[PDB]
Amino acid sequence: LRSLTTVWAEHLSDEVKRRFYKNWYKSKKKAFTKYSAKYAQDGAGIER
Amino acid sequence: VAYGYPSYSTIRQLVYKRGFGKINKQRVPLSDNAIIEANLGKYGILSIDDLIHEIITVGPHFKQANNFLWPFKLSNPSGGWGVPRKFKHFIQGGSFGNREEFINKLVKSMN
Amino acid sequence: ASLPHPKIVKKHTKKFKRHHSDRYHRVAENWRKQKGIDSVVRRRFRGNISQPKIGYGSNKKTKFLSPSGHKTFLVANVKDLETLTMHTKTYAAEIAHNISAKNRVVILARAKALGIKVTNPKGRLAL
Amino acid sequence: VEPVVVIDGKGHLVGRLASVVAKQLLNGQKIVVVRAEELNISGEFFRNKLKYHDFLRKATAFNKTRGPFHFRAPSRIFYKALRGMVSHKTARGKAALERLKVFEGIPPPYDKKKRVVVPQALRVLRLKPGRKYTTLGKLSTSVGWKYEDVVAKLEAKRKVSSAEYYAKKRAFTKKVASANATAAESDVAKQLAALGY
Amino acid sequence: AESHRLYVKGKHLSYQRSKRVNNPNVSLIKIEGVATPQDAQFYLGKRIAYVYRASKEVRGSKIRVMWGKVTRTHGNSGVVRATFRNNLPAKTFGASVRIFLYPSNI
Amino acid sequence: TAQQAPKWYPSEDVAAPKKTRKAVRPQKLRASLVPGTVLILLAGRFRGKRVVYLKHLEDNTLLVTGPFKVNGVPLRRVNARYVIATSTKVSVEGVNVEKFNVEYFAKEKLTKKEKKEANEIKTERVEDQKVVDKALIAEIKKTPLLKQYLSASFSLKNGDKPHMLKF
RNA sequence: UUGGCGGAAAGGCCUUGGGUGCUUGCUGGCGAAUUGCAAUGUCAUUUUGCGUGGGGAUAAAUCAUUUGUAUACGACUUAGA
RNA sequence: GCCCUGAAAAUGGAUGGCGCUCAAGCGUGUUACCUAUACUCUACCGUCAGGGUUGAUAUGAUGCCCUGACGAGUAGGCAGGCGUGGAGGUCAGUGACGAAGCCUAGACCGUAAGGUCGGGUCGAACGGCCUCUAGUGCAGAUCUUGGUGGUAGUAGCAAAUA
RNA sequence: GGAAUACUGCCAGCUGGGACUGAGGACUGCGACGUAAGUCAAGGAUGCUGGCAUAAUGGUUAUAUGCCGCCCGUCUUGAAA
RNA sequence: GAAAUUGUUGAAAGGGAAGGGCAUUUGAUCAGAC
């Protein structure tokens, strides 16, 4: 088995995105922010 | 040893190519009929063919003729020995012993 | 411009080093034959160092010949240099390590006059 | 002569193929092997299974993790049979084996390239008719290879795309095979025959 | 044309050796297309050049050549022994050499 | 002193060599070389150029020309071993070649003082060549496709075995 | 440039239109020289650096402090604009 | 005849390994081919043997040259040499304008012990040659004396209440 | 009844290709071709040409590769032990 | 003012030793003849 791809939600809660930071307090939190651009468009990046 | 009967051809090539004289207790190449004249002139031997004639026909002075010739130094046979193992009798599939005429074939490869 | 000589042949140029001279610091590299009962080098096993022997003796007609074609002859002063007056084509002069920097210019100026090749005409030159 | 020679192992004896591939690598020739699962080995199945269990006994007693690693996948089973015909502990032998790639089925790009066979290593030409042999794929899944079916399913999908490719190939060439015919018995065509072409 | 090759390919196979001892003064070369000593009989005396590359120029090129010639047949598959002016470095087992067609006999 | 002296000295007179017994004799070309033959050059700038053999010179060299108009090979001399001789032949009758000789090709090697830091043809050489080829080009015209043959380079392609091919 | 196909390691394959170069399918003209009788006679790919002018986005980790689901020490799990 | 049973030992394991089934096995035959310091021919080294050579100028008659054969080696014998301290003679030797020593993956000679040179260092004695003489040549002796390592910033520096 | 061919043997029969060697240094000897002159493959290589003339060949040194190589001294029949 | 033994700088190699022998590529370096 090899992981083909991953598709995340449009909005991620804070507590799940603390899992991606070792020093959460000093950070712009800067996660998936460019990945949210895949949403806000009907058929651009997600469904494909 | 591996011995046999040599023919005229076999003797002739040995002396012409590998013929060496034992003169003054030194091994000297023949390369000339005068050398034989100096030593073997006492028995009526003048040229290299006179010496060979004493070998092909075992003449009255064979011993003096034969002893004048150095022991020949031959090479390994050019085509191999023709057998897997040398040290079996020629009858038994090896090489040593009396082979009647096939010493001519062997010696020429050695020659 | 020395006399004609056959091509210089050495038959062995790597220096013979004593056995195990590289292993220990006390065993200096100057050759010494191994006399041991169980020495591999002494018995001449395969893959071991080679011992000096007369078969390595150089050709007599080119023995002692430096690459230039002249045999070397250490000289001490002008008188000793003159000994090579008539023999420039077989011998070369050499100035001893103890001949002073001021004296050396004396022999070179002379050797150039007689045309005798000096192997080391650069020692103790200040420039 | 090709920069890479791709070999289909099906119907080849594991050893004789391995020797031929072993010599080629040491000679600077690159080999890629595909469909290792259908390699053949002489002998019954239960005969060859036992030999593998004997190989499974040998392991370093005081620590198994360092002992002779017994690989199960057919590509590795063939690979072991070849590493022993290469001086693999020397820097030349490492260079020899890096010229080698062994595969299950025919993966990509090797699928769209010509595959050859080694006629001196073929089961049909070597073995006597009526003997008994094995198929490495049957054996490897019998000692712990977990991907017999994944290969089998994917390969059938491979052959499907190949079957139509032949169909376009054969249909297209047939039309080509006709145009040259009507170009025959021509002034150029007849004279090349005297030149043998 | 796209073909500009005026030699015959070959592979430097190994040194001349016994089971345990190799002789670095004589090399083993395989000429592709040759399968019998009779086929190889043609190439005897032909010139051989091993062309390699360096990172430093010697006389205006980054390319260097080691010359040599075919001495005699080896084996039964038409492998040939070649002795070089300077021995091939033994990291070229499997390297490609070039067997030029001169001195031609034809 | 440094070392005392060598007690004896060797002679410094160069000894004359013994009288040799090596006489030079005329060279024997292989039967494959006949004037008029088309050759393929194996070395030099013009390696792989099919070219015409005209004469056997004195110093074992083969006077050879393109002809120059066909492929651009002038009147040259090449070694008897650096050529490939074929079965194709072109007539050389009525062609004057006896004018050329060894001294005709004289280079006048430049002095060591002349050093090429960074950076021509004789007039008489060119008019010599145009004289010969005009008698040969017309001869080529009779055999079809020969003219294109002599303008075409030679090469070896894959699958081509020299020991098996025929030239 | 238009459209598809390929996930086993797809990184490739097919197809549409137009523009462009050459064409040895056939016939011609013009230059080859001098590398001096050979010298691989230098034509490939692998990485990196240094400037071009052309776009594009503007972070974390570790130490230190802290908890104890951790702990001989490192390590581990938490918290801290 | 081959094969099979009879045929059971202890770390995992050995036709040398891989591996081999009209064999890459067993029996038998014919060729081709591979390669030892062996055999042949040649060059060079040395030893031994047999010889030539007063001839002036020019040196060496222990010289120069010709001819043939031969070359393993512990214990052991003989011979030619290399090297060190000191002595008689010689070079009317080297040297404060740098002796001797010491360093030098810089140079040359000798098969070798060794010899010479260049650079660096330092500062006051030393060398070649013919002979004479010996407290004359070290890897070893659980060697003698002095010096120094790895172990290793390790063991540890924890009884008598703080 | 008459031949051919195989096999074995012989040629002081002819001829091609490939490799390694070039030792010796005035003449002297033995032979051949020639009427002679003289020539020669006959007691050991010369003739023609090119490039380079510098680190290019080569020495040494470190490393890389292929193959080989147990730690010396010692007593012992036997030592890497 | 040597060696053992050590510090810094420079160069090189390093998949359960290191070193050694025969040959050559590579880098460095160097002599002689012209």
Quick one: resolution in A? Answer: 4.3
Between CA E11 and CA E97 the distance in angstroms is 6
Yes or no: say if D33 and D102 are a contact pair by the CB < 8 Å rule: yes
Residue F36 to chain C, least CA–CA distance (Å): 46
For an interface test with F, give the residue of C63, C72, C91 to mutate (most F CBs within 10 A): C91
Between CA D133 and CA D126 the distance in angstroms is 12
Residue F115 to chain C, least CA–CA distance (Å): 27
Yes or no: say if F41 and F153 are a contact pair by the CB < 8 Å rule: no
Between CA D161 and CA D116 the distance in angstroms is 20
The answer to whether the Cβ–Cβ distance between F84 and E43 falls below 8 Å is no
Whether the beta carbon of E90 falls within 7 A of nucleic chain J: the reply is yes
- Tell me the backbone φ, ψ of residue F66, rounded to 5 degrees: -55, -65
Spatial neighbors of F120 by CB under 8 A, at least 6 apart, are none
Handedness of CA F136, F141, F146, F152 (dihedral sign): positive
Contacts E–F by Cβ distance under 8 A? 51
Q: Please provide the distance, in angstroms rounded to a whole number, between the alpha carbons at the two ends of chain E.
A: 25
Amino acid letter for position A5? T
The answer to whether the Cβ–Cβ distance between C86 and F12 falls below 8 Å is yes
Task: Please name the method used to determine this structure.
Answer: cryo-EM
Task: For nucleotide G39, give the residue with the nearest CA to its C1'.
Answer: F44
F79 forms beta bridges with F61
Rounded alpha-carbon distances, angstroms, from residue F96 to F54, F76, F99: 10, 15, 7
Chain F nearest-CA residue for C61 = F10
Between CA F155 and CA F167 the distance in angstroms is 13
Spatial neighbors of D159 by CB under 8 A, at least 6 apart, are none
Between CA D102 and CA D79 the distance in angstroms is 7
Whether the beta carbon of C17 falls within 7 A of nucleic chain J: the reply is yes
Between CA B32 and CA D19 the distance in angstroms is 61
Chain D nearest-CA residue for E30 = D27
Ranges of beta strands (E only) in chain C are 71-75, 91-95
Whether the beta carbon of E56 falls within 7 A of nucleic chain I: the reply is no
F85 has a chain E CB within 8 A of its CB = yes
Residue E92 to chain F, least CA–CA distance (Å): 23
- Tell me the backbone φ, ψ of residue D99, rounded to 5 degrees: -80, 10
Chains touching B (3+ CB pairs < 8 Å): none
Residue F1 to chain C, least CA–CA distance (Å): 5
Query: Tokens at residue A16, please?
Result: 């799940």
D28 has a chain E CB within 8 A of its CB = yes
Helix (H) or strand (E) holding C9: none
Segments in D58-122 forming alpha helices (H)? 74-83, 91-98
Yes or no: say if D96 and D90 are a contact pair by the CB < 8 Å rule: no
Whether the beta carbon of B104 falls within 7 A of nucleic chain I: the reply is yes
Residue F86 has a CB neighbour count (10 Å cut-off) of: 16
Q: How far is the CA of F3 from the C1' of H91 (A)?
A: 10
Helix (H) or strand (E) holding C119: none
Residue C50 buriedness (CB in 10 A; 0-12 / 13-18 / 19+): exposed
Query: Tokens at residue E101, please?
Result: 């067609």
Give the alpha-carbon dihedral of B95, B97, B102, B103, to 10 degrees. 100
Q: What is the 3-state secondary structure (H, E, C) of chain F?
A: CCCCCCCCCCCCCCCCCCCCCCCCCCCCCCCCCCCCEEEEECCCCCCCEEEEEEEECCCCEEEEECCHHHHCCCCEEEECCCEEEEEEECCCCCCCCCCCCCCCCCCCCCCCCCCCCCCCCCHHHHHHHHHHHHHHHHHHHHCCCHHHHHCCECCECCCCCCCCCCC
Q: What is the 3-state secondary structure (H, E, C) of chain B?
A: CEECCCCHHHHHHHHHHHCEEEECCEEEECCCHHHHHHHHHHHCCCCHHHHHHHHHCCCCCHHHHHHHECCCCCCCCCCCCCCCCCCCEHHHCCCEEECCCHHHHHHHHHC
Amino acid letter for position F119? N
E52 forms beta bridges with E64
Amino acid letter for position F73? V
